């Protein structure tokens, strides 16, 4: 049986980067051939592992993380990077073994009035540890005075929306991202190639 790659890449709706979705992939035969030769990905960067060679080795557990960010932020989905997305939303480990895949989704995730379905976190008390998720909506205290849950001066709601519109420049257009994490351990390895 084939791996549920079509369920991740061809999904109707992706998650917001602050609530990025993770799917563990196991017990299937992965056909990476349709992936790296699709001609529709603007970013196909692999670290540690090698593309066109993934079809050879078996893997213990394969994780697929997907979300939506804007084009100028795709560079932050890489090891050891800094920015609003890497710091507060989705943090890749410095010693990451896997592939980052991204493609322009303006035709799907943009409405003329503005698509407010996709959010991102703008403030956080600390940076995110690798692969950590924060979906809380607590008022952020920007000053020294307490906020006590009241939104106001120096007290901000931490989530903001992209408002994707099709007339945006490419740097502000929505980009669907899929991060494939690969791990090999002495466990029943059930993610092999053809």
């Amino acid at each position: 049986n084939l791996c549920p790659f079509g369920e991740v890449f061809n999904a109707t709706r992706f998650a917001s980067v602050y609530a990025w979705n993770r799917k563990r992939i196991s017990n299937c035969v992965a056909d990476y051939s349709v992936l790296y030769n699709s001609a529709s990905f603007s970013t196909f960067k692999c670290y540690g592992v090698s593309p066109t060679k993934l079809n050879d080795l078996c893997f213990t557990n394969v994780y697929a993380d997907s979300f939506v960010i804007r084009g100028d932020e795709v560079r932050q989905i890489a090891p050891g990077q800094t920015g609003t997305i890497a710091d507060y939303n989705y943090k890749l480990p410095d010693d990451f073994t896997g592939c980052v895949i991204a493609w322009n989704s303006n035709n799907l995730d943009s409405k003329v009035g503005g698509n407010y379905n996709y959010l991102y976190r703008l403030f956080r008390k600390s940076n995110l540890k690798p692969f950590e998720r924060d979906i809380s909506t607590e008022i952020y205290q920007a000053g020294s005075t307490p906020c006590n849950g009241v939104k106001g001066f120096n007290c901000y709601f931490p989530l903001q929306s992209y408002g994707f519109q099709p007339t945006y420049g490419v740097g502000y257009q929505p980009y669907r991202v899929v991060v494939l994490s690969f791990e090999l351990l002495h466990a029943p390895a059930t993610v092999c190639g053809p």
Binding site: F153, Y156, T167, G169, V170, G171
Partner: protein, 596 residues
């Protein structure tokens, strides 16, 4: 957290919501200007109202972070740009009273009608009628009627309103801690806190008057040459030693002398070059013009137009299906969305304004990576100066040959260059005394150096002394001739047209030495010069993030407005005019009047 860290968090929140709301107001404004429907007016006004209300509350919040406690210069400039923008410390009743005055003056200007002495049912507006007379008529009496009646019907209506407008605007300026409304306008050039680059509000007046003193010799000889040619156009109407009558200058006010070219042409047997006929022969369309303008900026190392530019701009009149505002404008909607609004025709003029308007886009694209509040020109004169130098290079015979619009073996006589340079001077040089004198009068009026009982008396004293222009009929204090100009009655600063003109020739001179140009400055084309494109880009990318004195230094190597580059551009004409005025009197007497 420190005050500076708190302010940085505040700008992070502000930049996100401001970009969203400004885009929505820009998209609604775009849809109205490309499609005039009542629904689009409502969407434009509501989106604009939402943006104005947002700026007003964010300005009050920005004032809660004291400027003196911020150390980062980029954070200080964003906070200062927000504390001053959206501020309305005027009282409620006085703010509504001022807005009513502003709207009344604007309506009087755009609807004011002048009717023929022969027929009171034959009435002419300024917008298509009086301007046509002042631009094309060769009849002394027809021009005098249009000139005097516009000031008699419309001008006298604005006088009482402009009186209250002065005091109410001065009250608004004192509420923002400026000395008067003139001081408030000059605040655009102010720089505080940067050692070596500072510039005070009073320094602008001295720098404008110092540069203008060096313009006087060139203008005097332009004035003397035009006078002698005008004596033949209107014999027995012009004194050989007096000022030029105000109604014979080519428009309603003498703002530009461009339409006087047909009477003052140096060599009327040599026609000015015009590649309009070459474009139609080679089947050029609007897309080719803008594709050629794109090739020009790419040739100097600047980026191509975005794919959204070609898909979202309006480069032709939509037709009868949509009514559009056909006025060339460059749009920076934010979020990487840049468009040009133009009803382009296949003519040399529209070819040149395409390079002008794309120059704005290149400026907007270059500083897009700046924070939102810094995405503006260095000062109010930088942007149009950037667009003007694109038109300068694109118009040269060197450039037009390079793109196939002029013949490879076309020959440039010095007579055609003098023809070109004089047409330039009538527009460029002729407007500088007009502009300086107009703002000077407004500055002295705002600060109270000219009381209302001497408004018109001082106005025509400076028109005679500075501009060399005399009223054809006397005007008492029931007149308000300044308000007869759009900028004065619609509350718009004017000195930017003076500073921008000096800026543009400072830029072009500096870019042409970077392009290793050898001949006279006016023959220069910066095309295919990577070094010239980099020198300009090192300023364009700054936006408002640095003082305008530093931005000017990155291009011209100097921190101040300088008039020598302008004088160098017109040096071939200056030498020619001096020889033509050997037999004529150079300068003017302020005593002569057409009515005396």
């Amino acid at each position: 957290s420190t005050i500076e860290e708190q302010a940085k968090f505040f700008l992070d929140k502000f930049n996100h919501e401001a970009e969203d709301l400004f885009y929505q107001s820009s998209l609604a404004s775009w849809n109205y200007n490309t499609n005039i429907t009542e629904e689009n007016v409502q969407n434009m006004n509501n989106a604009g109202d939402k943006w104005s209300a947002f700026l007003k509350e964010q300005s009050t919040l920005a004032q809660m972070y004291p400027l003196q406690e911020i150390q980062n210069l980029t954070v200080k400039l964003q906070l200062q740009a927000l504390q001053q923008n959206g501020s309305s410390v005027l009282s409620e009743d006085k703010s509504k009273r001022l807005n009513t005055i502003l709207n009344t003056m604007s309506t009087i200007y755009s609807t004011g009608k002048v009717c023929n002495p022969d027929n009171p049912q034959e009435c002419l507006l300024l917008e298509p009628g009086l301007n046509e007379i002042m631009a094309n008529s060769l009849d002394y009496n027809e021009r005098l009627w249009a000139w005097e009646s516009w000031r008699s019907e419309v001008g006298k209506q604005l006088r009482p309103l402009y009186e209250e407008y002065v005091v109410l605007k001065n009250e608004m300026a004192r509420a923002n801690h400026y000395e008067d409304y003139g001081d408030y306008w000059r605040g655009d050039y102010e720089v505080n806190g940067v050692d070596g680059y500072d510039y005070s509000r009073g320094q602008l007046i001295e720098d404008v008057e110092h540069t203008f003193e060096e313009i006087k010799p060139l203008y005097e000889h332009l004035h003397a040459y035009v006078r002698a040619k005008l004596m033949n156009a209107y014999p027995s109407y012009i004194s050989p030693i007096g000022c030029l009558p105000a109604h014979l200058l080519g428009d309603m006010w003498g703002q530009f002398w461009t339409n006087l070219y047909s009477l003052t042409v140096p060599f009327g047997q040599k026609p000015n070059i015009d590649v309009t006929d070459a474009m139609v022969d080679q089947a050029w369309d609007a897309q080719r013009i803008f594709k050629e303008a794109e090739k020009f900026f790419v040739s100097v190392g600047l980026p191509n137009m975005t794919q959204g530019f070609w898909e979202n701009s309006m480069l032709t009149d939509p037709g009868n299906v949509q009514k559009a505002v056909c006025h060339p404008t460059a749009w920076d909607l934010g979020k990487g969305d840049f468009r040009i609004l133009m009803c382009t025709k296949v003519t040399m003029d529209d070819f040149l304004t395409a390079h002008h308007e794309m120059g704005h886009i290149q400026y907007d694209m270059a500083y897009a990576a700046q924070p939102f509040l810094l995405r503006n020109g260095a000062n109010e004169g930088f942007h149009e100066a950037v667009g003007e130098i694109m038109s300068l290079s694109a118009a040269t015979p060197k450039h037009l040959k390079s793109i196939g619009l002029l013949s490879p073996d076309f020959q440039e006589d010095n007579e055609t260059e003098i023809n070109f340079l004089l047409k330039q001077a009538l527009t460029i040089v002729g407007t500088l005394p007009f502009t300086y004198m107009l703002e000077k009068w407004r500055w002295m009026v705002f600060k109270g150096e000219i009381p209302k009982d001497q408004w018109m008396k001082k106005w025509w004293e400076m028109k005679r002394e500075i501009v060399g222009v005399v009223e054809p009929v006397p005007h008492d204090e029931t007149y308000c001739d300044p308000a007869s100009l759009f900028h004065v009655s619609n509350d718009y600063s004017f000195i930017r047209y003076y500073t921008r003109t000096l800026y543009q020739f400072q830029f072009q001179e500096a870019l042409c030495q970077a392009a290793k140009h050898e001949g006279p400055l006016h023959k220069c084309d910066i095309s295919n010069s990577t070094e010239a494109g980099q020198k300009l880009f090192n300023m364009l990318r700054l936006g408002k993030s640095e003082p305008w004195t530093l931005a000017l230094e990155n291009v011209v190597g100097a921190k101040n407005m300088n008039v020598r580059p302008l004088l160098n551009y017109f040096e071939p004409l200056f030498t020619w005019l001096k020889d033509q005025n050997k037999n004529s009197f150079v300068g003017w007497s302020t005593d002569w009047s057409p009515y005396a």
